[PDB]
Amino acid sequence: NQIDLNVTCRYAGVFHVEKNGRYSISRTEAADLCQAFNSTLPTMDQMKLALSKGFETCRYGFIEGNVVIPRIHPNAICAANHTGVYILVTSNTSHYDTYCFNASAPPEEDCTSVTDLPNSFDGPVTITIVNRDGTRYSKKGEYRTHQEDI
Numbered sequence: 001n002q003i004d005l006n007v008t009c010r011y012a013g014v015f016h017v018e019k020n021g022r023y024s025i026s027r028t029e030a031a032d033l034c035q036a037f038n039s040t041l042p043t044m045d046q047m048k049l050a051l052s053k054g055f056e057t058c059r060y061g062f063i064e065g066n067v068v069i070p071r072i073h074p075n076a077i078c079a080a081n082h083t084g085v086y087i088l089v090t091s092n093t094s095h096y097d098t099y100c101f102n103a104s105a106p107p108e109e110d111c112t113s114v115t116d117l118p119n120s121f122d123g124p125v126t127i128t129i130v131n132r133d134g135t136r137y138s139k140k141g142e143y144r145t146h147q148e149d150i
């Protein structure tokens with residue numbers, strides 16, 4: 001009864017979260033996950049500012065209203081060599097990573113570790129935050145509010 005959450009640096013408060021090392025988050029779970037980090041799904045404008053501060057990934061994830069990949073450098077295997085906030089247009093499937101936005105983060109790049117899931121609720125799951133440098137923080141709790149996600 002364990003969930004690993006891989007988290008990135010924040011860029012203008014925006015970060016990427018991947019659950020259990022694979023595309024595995026529904027739209028509803030993504031909102032609940034961001035809420036657990038006292039965050040929200042980013043708007044497109046928030047994501048564009050994050051991009052301008054250095055944010056890029058090679059993974060699809062939810063924002064408010066779309067699934068996107070922020071890209072700074074063109075790479076053939078990431079968003080088909082596009083740059084900018086690449087919007088996923090056509091897909092059969094519903095599960096991705098998520099982006100989240102924390103307004104209380106620093107204004108530019110913050111590559112410090114994340115060491116709390118401050119708004120998790122009581123529950124039986126061992127939830128582990130994993131930072132890119134390997135630092136880990138674990139707590140027992142839950143964050144999913146929709147049964148179809150459990």
Ligand SMILES: COC(=O)CCN1CCc2ccccc2C1
Nearest residue numbers: 006007016057058059130131132
């Ligand atoms: C930046 O997001 C990506 O393109 C996927 C990279 N993942 C790769 C795995 C990983 C593990 C822990 C914390 C962060 C990350 C970042």
